[PDB]
Amino acid sequence: SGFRKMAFPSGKVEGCMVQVTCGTTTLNGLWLDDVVYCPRHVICTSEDMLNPNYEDLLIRKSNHNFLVQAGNVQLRVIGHSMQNCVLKLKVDTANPKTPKYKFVRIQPGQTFSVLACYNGSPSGVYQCAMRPNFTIKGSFLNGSCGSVGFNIDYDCVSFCYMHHMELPTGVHAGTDLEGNFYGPFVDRQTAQAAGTDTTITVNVLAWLYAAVINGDRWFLNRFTTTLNDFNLVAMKYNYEPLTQDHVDILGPLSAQTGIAVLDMCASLKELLQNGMNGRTILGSALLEDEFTPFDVVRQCSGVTFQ
Amino acid sequence: SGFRKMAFPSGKVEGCMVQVTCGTTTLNGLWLDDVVYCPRHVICTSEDMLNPNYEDLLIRKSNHNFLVQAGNVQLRVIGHSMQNCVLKLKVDTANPKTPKYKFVRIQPGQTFSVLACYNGSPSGVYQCAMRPNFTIKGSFLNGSCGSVGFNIDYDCVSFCYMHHMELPTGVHAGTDLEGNFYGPFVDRQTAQAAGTDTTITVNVLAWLYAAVINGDRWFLNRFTTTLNDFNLVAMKYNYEPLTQDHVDILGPLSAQTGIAVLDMCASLKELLQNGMNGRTILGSALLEDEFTPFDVVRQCSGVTFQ
Ligand SMILES: */C(=C/C(=O)N1CCN(CC2CCN(c3cc4c(cc3F)C(=O)N([C@@H]3CCC(=O)NC3=O)C4=O)CC2)CC1)[C@H](C[C@H]1CCNC1=O)NC(=O)[C@@H](CC(C)C)NC(=O)OCc1ccccc1
Ligand SMILES: */C(=C/C(=O)N1CCN(CC2CCN(c3cc4c(cc3F)C(=O)N([C@@H]3CCC(=O)NC3=O)C4=O)CC2)CC1)[C@H](C[C@H]1CCNC1=O)NC(=O)[C@@H](CC(C)C)NC(=O)OCc1ccccc1
């Protein structure tokens, strides 16, 4: 038993990380087949980043202005092009460790693993949710851009995130692997607001179910509620509104624990209105919203990867 | 910026995981050079585990009673022996993906990465501390035994943990890779007590320093204290007593933040005595003790692995 924030094994993605240098900027790139993907802002100087004209900047760059290194081997760059906010560097060699993979654009509230890298060398792995406001709360230092996020379905890596920025609030922003930002952000060093950060209500409910499965139960009260009633309390606390879709997704956990979803809502409502009274749930003193229903089922069925 | 519980990249350890079956029990083994390490209780039936005589049980087992599988390839077992609570299975093939590695026995309060596995297939990676009472709080289901914990120093994997058991309190227990349990536990299905679980005071202080580095500062008060004075307050809250060794270890963070360690102690003391007043620190509503001074420095310097 027990329940922890857990990242996917990172082996398949480690084999795809490289170092991309242009001028004096170095960051990470993702090397799949004969293409290297990295943030287009590799082409910027510190001065450029205040207000870049990427199209004009890229025009000054040739294939040979891009240095790609895998360990100690230099890849030859035979083509380059800008897709939205990502630069695509064509090389003369297919990565012999390319896993089976997809590019996917994930939905708010979904989770994924980040392999944080510096100089194209993996540093560490942690779990992130795409928050409702299209930021993540990660751990990113200078040189970490180009680090990716991903999910694995058995042997298929689904890439969903590439790291580009930190906002003034200290949270993080980035693109899918087609170079389209999550959220209303742009790859420019200017003040940018993410909206109000709402809580992923369905995720909190899954975690409460997880808690019940791991024997955490003080919080289970004797009330039930309605979808509309709970949601009037959700909005007050900046919780995402709950839908029958969400109820159905929680269906397996509800069916396993024997707790109707609307009963768990009633218990969550009282949690929201009365706080935790200095207690903890699965080892936390606040309500956790970065575990999907899938994340908890995974960790109750013992799904493995190959 | 930002600060997260982060596991080491798991690629080098993934290549060492195999499946070990004996009779009808299946669990994980670690395949390094031409040896496979796994918990000796692979040789037990469900009935055996109530009171096993391992020596008598092992006597009935031959080399051929052990099935070792790497993916779909069966390794041939040419020798077996019991070292403490681990079984060592000699095979006719050296693992071609054996990384550089060490066996180390870690100290209480230190941290390490767990690669949770089932059927010799990696499932996920998370970070654990060897608590002062020699348990860990992990996420382990049936079939997860033989999963290992490790640290990486650049290219060297230091193996320090193999998973064996869950205690009645829901926490986890296991051995070093020489098969010696951490703590007073035995590989038998009987009620076993870990003592009082104390908090790793030095770790909490490192995390408070991390918080300061990431801009969390309400908790910084105007008091200082003495080592003996703080420790009189530590013991009351079941905190580990703080020593000049601990002070020195925090020296780099103290020197970077400009906060004397004893000032941080005074702030921690008031945190302990007055609680958090519904506030949070680095996104948590309680005091975190599973980040070592090394874990926070790592995440402030951007150390990478190769
Ligand atoms: C992600 C990636 C990124 O693009 N950068 C760019 C800046 N930086 C690299 C710096 C490092 C210092 N510097 C420099 C570097 C190098 C040399 C000289 C030099 F002056 C140099 O010679 N070399 C190599 C190696 C060293 C050497 O000796 N010889 C060489 O030839 C150098 O490498 C200039 C370049 C790294 C970051 C970040 C992600 C941030 C969030 C997470 N933490 C972050 O910093 N950059 C951005 O996000 C940035 C994108 C722009 C809009 C284009 N925006 C941003 O987030 O800014 C706000 C911010 C920044 C930091 C913290 C908080 C907020
Ligand atoms: C770690 C490892 C471990 O050794 N075990 C042993 C028991 N279990 C395997 C079971 C599973 C059910 N069962 C069985 C298995 C298989 C077949 C038939 C069958 F009846 C079978 O035919 N096969 C294969 C595959 C299936 C098939 O169709 N054909 C085959 O041939 C089978 O595999 C009997 C064997 C898995 C666990 C755990 C770690 C615990 C902590 C973390 N979660 C845990 O469960 N075991 C222990 O820790 C245990 C060690 C003993 C002291 C020796 N002690 C313990 O923790 O017990 C208390 C406890 C247990 C669970 C939860 C909480 C507390």
Give a structural overview.
Chains A, B: There is a cross-link at residues 5, 90 (Glycyl lysine isopeptide (Lys-Gly) (interchain with G-Cter in ubiquitin)). Chains A, B: It is found in: Host cytoplasm; Host Golgi apparatus; Host nucleus. Chains A, B: Residues 1-306 form the Peptidase C30 domain. Chains A, B: The active site is at 41 (for 3cl-pro activity), 145 (nucleophile). Chain A is elongated. Chain A has 306 residues and is α+β, with helices and mostly antiparallel strands. Chain A has three domains: 1-14 and 100-197, Trypsin-like serine proteases (Thrombin, subunit H), CATH 2.40.10; 15-99, Trypsin-like serine proteases (Thrombin, subunit H); 198-301, main proteinase (3clpro) structure, domain 3, CATH 1.10.1840. Chain A has helices at 11-14, 54-59, 201-213, 227-236, 244-249, 251-257, 261-274, 293-301, and strands spanning 17-22, 25-32, 35-39, 66-70, 73-75, 77-83, 86-91, 100-103, 111-118, 121-129, 148-153, 156-166, 172-175. In chain A, α3 packs across α7, α3 runs parallel beside α8 and α4 (227-236) runs parallel beside α7 (261-274). In chain A, 23% of the residues lie in helices and 27% in strands. The longest helix of chain A has 14 residues, at 261-274. In chain A, the strands form two sheets. A seven-stranded antiparallel β-sheet of chain A has the order 5-4-1-2-3-7-6, with no helix packed on it. Chains A and B meet through β9, β10 and α8 of A and β9, β10 and α8 of B. The complex binds ligand VQN (2 copies). One ligand VQN is lined by residues 24-27, 41, 44, 46, 49, 140-145, 164-166, 172, 187-189 of chain A.
